[PDB]
Structures are given as structure tokens and as C-alpha cells.
Amino acid sequence: SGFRKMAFPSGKVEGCMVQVTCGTTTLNGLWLDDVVYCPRHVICTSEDMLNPNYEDLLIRKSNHNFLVQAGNVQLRVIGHSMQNCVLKLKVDTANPKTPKYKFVRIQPGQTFSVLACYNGSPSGVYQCAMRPNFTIKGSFLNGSCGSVGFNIDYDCVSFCYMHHMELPTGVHAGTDLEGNFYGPFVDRQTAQAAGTDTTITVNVLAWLYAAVINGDRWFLNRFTTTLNDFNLVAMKYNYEPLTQDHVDILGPLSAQTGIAVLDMCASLKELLQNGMNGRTILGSALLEDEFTPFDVVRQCSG
Amino acid sequence: SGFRKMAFPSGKVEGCMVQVTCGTTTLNGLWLDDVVYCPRHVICTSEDMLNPNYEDLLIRKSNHNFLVQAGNVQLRVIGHSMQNCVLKLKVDTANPKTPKYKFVRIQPGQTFSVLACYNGSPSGVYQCAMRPNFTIKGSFLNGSCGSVGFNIDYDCVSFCYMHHMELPTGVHAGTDLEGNFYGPFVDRQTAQAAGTDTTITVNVLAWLYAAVINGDRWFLNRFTTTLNDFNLVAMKYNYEPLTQDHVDILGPLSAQTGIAVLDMCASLKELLQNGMNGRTILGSALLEDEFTPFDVVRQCSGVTF
Numbered sequence A: 001s002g003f004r005k006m007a008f009p010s011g012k013v014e015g016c017m018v019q020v021t022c023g024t025t026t027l028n029g030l031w032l033d034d035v036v037y038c039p040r041h042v043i044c045t046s047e048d049m050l051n052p053n054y055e056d057l058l059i060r061k062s063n064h065n066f067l068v069q070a071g072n073v074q075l076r077v078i079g080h081s082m083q084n085c086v087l088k089l090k091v092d093t094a095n096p097k098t099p100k101y102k103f104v105r106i107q108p109g110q111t112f113s114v115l116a117c118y119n120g121s122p123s124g125v126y127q128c129a130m131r132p133n134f135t136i137k138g139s140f141l142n143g144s145c146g147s148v149g150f151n152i153d154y155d156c157v158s159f160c161y162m163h164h165m166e167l168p169t170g171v172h173a174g175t176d177l178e179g180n181f182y183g184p185f186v187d188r189q190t191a192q193a194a195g196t197d198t199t200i201t202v203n204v205l206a207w208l209y210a211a212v213i214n215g216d217r218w219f220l221n222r223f224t225t226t227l228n229d230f231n232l233v234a235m236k237y238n239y240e241p242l243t244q245d246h247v248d249i250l251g252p253l254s255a256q257t258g259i260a261v262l263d264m265c266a267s268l269k270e271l272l273q274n275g276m277n278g279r280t281i282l283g284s285a286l287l288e289d290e291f292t293p294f295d296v297v298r299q300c301s302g
Numbered sequence B: 001s002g003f004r005k006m007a008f009p010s011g012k013v014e015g016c017m018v019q020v021t022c023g024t025t026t027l028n029g030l031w032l033d034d035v036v037y038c039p040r041h042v043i044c045t046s047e048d049m050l051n052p053n054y055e056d057l058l059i060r061k062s063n064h065n066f067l068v069q070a071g072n073v074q075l076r077v078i079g080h081s082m083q084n085c086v087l088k089l090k091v092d093t094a095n096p097k098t099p100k101y102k103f104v105r106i107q108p109g110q111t112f113s114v115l116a117c118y119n120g121s122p123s124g125v126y127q128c129a130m131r132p133n134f135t136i137k138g139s140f141l142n143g144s145c146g147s148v149g150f151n152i153d154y155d156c157v158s159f160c161y162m163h164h165m166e167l168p169t170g171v172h173a174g175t176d177l178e179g180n181f182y183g184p185f186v187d188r189q190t191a192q193a194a195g196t197d198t199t200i201t202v203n204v205l206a207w208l209y210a211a212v213i214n215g216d217r218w219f220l221n222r223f224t225t226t227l228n229d230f231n232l233v234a235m236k237y238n239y240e241p242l243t244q245d246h247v248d249i250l251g252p253l254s255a256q257t258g259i260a261v262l263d264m265c266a267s268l269k270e271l272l273q274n275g276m277n278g279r280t281i282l283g284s285a286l287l288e289d290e291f292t293p294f295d296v297v298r299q300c301s302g303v304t305f
């Protein structure tokens, strides 16, 4: 029993974190096999963060311009290439702690653990979700760039995020491990704004199912709704549209608790209309949206 | 920017988790040097659960009755002893991944990271606090016993909790690594209840300072209060008393934000008496109490391990 925001154990990722320095800039790198992945903005000059030409800046660098430190050992850079917004530094030593891994690009609503790092050293682990507006509400300070997001379903680490920057509103933007940004963001100092953020409806429903599994039924009602009437109400509270895919995904939780997805949608509609009236659901006075249907099943059933 | 519930990196602890089996029971063990620590209730059967005599149950066990598995390797148990509610299994191999460590007993209000494990395999990490009623609002399923709570202070892992059981309300009870329970709990199937819980006042103040550091100021006001008047209000709302020690500990955050601790207490008093009025603080409509002043400074300054 109990329901917590739970991150994956970070050990497999901790053994991959290294510090990457290029000139006056220091950030984190991810060392997997003989490659160190890091944000390409590590080569960006202070004099021009507005319109860097990364191809032009990189062609001027030699391998000895990249200082990679793994613990107290300096790794030797023997090659470098750029893939989208990620720099890949070939090193002369394969990481002996490289776990079984894969690179996965995630969709909005998906959750992942973040190992926040500074100077190649892990400082903390937290759980978060890719917002519908493609930002993440992380906790990151200066020098956190290169810190990664990941999932560890079984013994394989699926790396899904690499932190690149903080937007003016305090939210964060990054790329997958192929260097493709999530969202309409670019790695340069230009006016960039996160689009209006919305609530991840399918995740709120998953978390309401988690509450029912943990004995909380106060918010249930004798009503049901059509999917279209639910979405008409949902949009008015800045909730993401609930698709038939989302309804299908909630099927197992619906079958486990005996509450149909549209029956739970009617509870969500009532919660949006009334608020919680001094009550809580799983220790929260807000509707939580950073637990996916998969997270709920994993945490409740094992 | 941003403020999250953040756990310590768990890698140093993951390298210590093992599976301990005694008969039909399987749970987790903590392998440090040549000793595997686990809940002594691993030696209980169904009938034993109601009123177990652990000394009597243990004297009947031989070393080979304990099957310890570290990854895919079986460790050889060469001795066993009981300390309070923890069983210590001497093994023939020192854990080569044993980090620098210490066993510490924490006080209510103090936070720690929990590495939830099943069958000796880490499944998740979360941050929680030792409640004033000595329970933890954890997230644990069957077989999670032996999962541990810890902090990292510089390069040293301080183990402070070992999971033992779940109470009827869904909250959890365990011991320090010396086998002493936190709270008035016993390791047997008997009617046990978590006492009425209270809010960790110093932690709520720390989290209000974290909100100010992150740009949330709506709850600030021009007022201040005395420590005695604040404690009279705090007692009315089931908040723990705020001591002069708590005020001193919040000193650095007070100096950083320009909000004296009693000035922040006046914000907390108004929030208790009036609510949040539709507003949130750091993405929460409740006053969060599972961040200590040290957690706030550590996260708002990026301390690494």
C-alpha cells in the first residue's frame, strides 16, 4: 500500500556520468561504451549564444580541446562528431560500467527519472513527465546541462532525455539522445517561450485508478459520460483531450477496479467542477498528472 | 529553477541489496562487508506470526537454512546472530561494492531516501520523512521487507531505516540498522495502530523558503510573530512545536531570502487560518513537510555525491 512519486534506481546511470569541459564551459556528459554524449552548446562562445553556427564552431576544435573527466581520471578524446544538438566524443576507453541500454524518444505525458548532475557528479534523482508543451518541470541549476532522463523497465536503461536549457518561465528543455529537441526549441539564446501547458488527462485518470486501488473511493459517482462530452468539459480546465487510445490504455486498470473508463471520466468531471472540498486523494489536494497508466500498474501490482 | 522531491543517488545502496530466503519466506537483505542485515521476521512461519519467540525460532536454524543471493551468485552463510529486530548473517565473502557507511538513527522530521526492493533487486527510489508518529508514508508491496532508507553526508552512506511491515492504515514501520523500531511497534501480527500524526513545522518553513527562492512570494506578508504565539497557533493545527533550534537551523535560508524565521511563521499562521485561496505553492495546494532545511539548501545549491 501507499503511492509515491517513485524514480528508478539511479546506479546504472551514475556510473555513466562524466564532466565535459570545452574552454570556460563545464557540463555533464553521458559515457556509454567509448562515446561521451553531451549538449553541443558546450562549444558555444560567451560572446555569441544568440546565433551559434555549431558546424563552424566544431570544425575549429581539436580532440584536445575537450577535457573529459570520469571520477578522478581524465579520459582521452580521440574523435568528435555532432548529431543534431548532441556532441559525441569518441574516447580511448570503453566505460566498464556501461549498462544494457537503448535510446528512446518519448511522447508528451510519458514519465522518466532524472539524475541531476553537476561537474559530472550525481546530486539527486527525481521523477518527472514530458509536459504536453514538450517542456519538463525539472529542478536544475547552472551546469546541470547534460544530466539525463531515463527509465529502467527490467535491467535495460532507456535514455530518453538530455537536459540542454532552462526557459524564461523556469521550465526545462532538452533533446532525446539522438540530439533532437523535444518541442519547438533551439539551442541558442533567442526569445523562446513554452506554449500554454495543459494537464495530462490520461495520467490523472491513471492516478484516480491508483487511488481506488489504494482504497480511496470518495470521488466516485453514479454517472458516466460520452468521450466527446468529457473532452468538451476537459478542455475548459486546460486538460489535454482524452483519445480512444487513452481509453484503451486504461482498460487493464478499469478491469482491475471494476470502474469503466467513462465512469472514471465522470468522476474527473465532477472533481474539476467541485474541487476536493477539504479532502485529499493519495496525499494530494491537486489532481496529479505525472503518473502514467504503466507507472500505476508497476507501482501497485509489481 | 524548479523544486522537486529528490532522493539521493541510489547506486551505492543498490550494490548492497541481496535476497534472503528462509524456508518459504523471501525478503531483502543489506550486504555490507561480510554481514547481511535483514528483518528477523524472515524466520517466522504462519503460526509463528501471532506470537513469535525469535530466540527459540533462531536457535533451530542452521547456516544453510538462510539462502542469500547476490545477483545470480549464492553467498555462503557461515554465522548468524540477532540484534534487536535485525538478523545479521555472517557470509564468507565481503561485499566488494561496500561503500563508506555508518548506521545512524534519525529523529522524526528527518528525511531519507528509500530504495524499494523485491527479491534483492532494486525497483525504485523515493524520498520520504520519518513522521512525528514514527511511521513512514512509503510505497511498499509484499516482499519489500529489508528495503532500506539512507542519506549521503559527503562520501558516506548513513543507513537509517530498514523496512519491516505495513500497518492497517497503509503506512509503514521499520527499524534503524541496529534493529530498534522507530515508534511503538512490534514485529508480530497483532493489533497495532499509527498514532495521530502531526505536520513537521520546521520542514514546512523550509519548503516555504524554497518557494521564495523559486519566485513564489504571494504568501509573504508584512507581519511577524513571537515564537510562543506561533506555537500556540501551531498546536491548534496539529503542527509540531517550533523550537529555537529550528529557528537557528533556518538561519541561512532566512539570511538568503530576507525573510526572518518569525516573519515566515506569520505567513504560515495566515495560511493555516485562511487556507491558500485557490493558489498553489511550488505546484502544491497543501503545505509540504517532507523537505528539511538541509534538503532545501542542498537542492537550491546543487551538492553532489
Ligand SMILES: CC(C)(C)c1ccc(N(C(=O)c2ccco2)[C@@H](C(=O)NCCc2cccc(F)c2)c2cccnc2)cc1
Pocket (backbone or CB within 6 Å): A025, A026, A027, A041, A042, A044, A049, A140, A141, A142, A143, A144, A145, A164, A165, A166, A167, A168, A187, A188, A189, A190, A191, A192, B001
Ligand atoms: C544554449 C545556451 C544558450 C548556450 C545555453 C546557455 C546556458 C545554459 N545553462 C547552463 O546552466 C549551462 C551550463 C553550461 C552551459 O550552460 C542555463 C540556461 O539554460 N540558461 C538560460 C539560457 C537561455 C537563454 C535564452 C533562452 C533560452 F531558452 C535559454 C541553465 C540553468 C538552469 C538549468 N539548466 C540550464 C544552457 C544553454
Ligand SMILES: CC(C)(C)c1ccc(N(C(=O)c2ccco2)[C@@H](C(=O)NCCc2cccc(F)c2)c2cccnc2)cc1
Pocket (backbone or CB within 6 Å): A001, B025, B026, B027, B041, B044, B049, B140, B141, B142, B143, B144, B145, B164, B165, B166, B167, B168, B187, B188, B189, B190, B191, B192
Ligand atoms: C512481522 C510479520 C507479521 C511476520 C510480517 C508479515 C508480513 C509482512 N509483509 C510482507 O510483505 C513480508 C515479506 C516477507 C515477509 O513478510 C507485509 C505486512 O506488513 N503485512 C501485514 C503484517 C502485519 C500484521 C499485523 C500488524 C502489522 F503491523 C503488520 C508487507 C506488505 C507491504 C509492505 N510491507 C510489508 C511483514 C511482516
Ligand SMILES: [Cl-]
Pocket (backbone or CB within 6 Å): A105, A106, A107, A110
Ligand atoms: Cl512514450
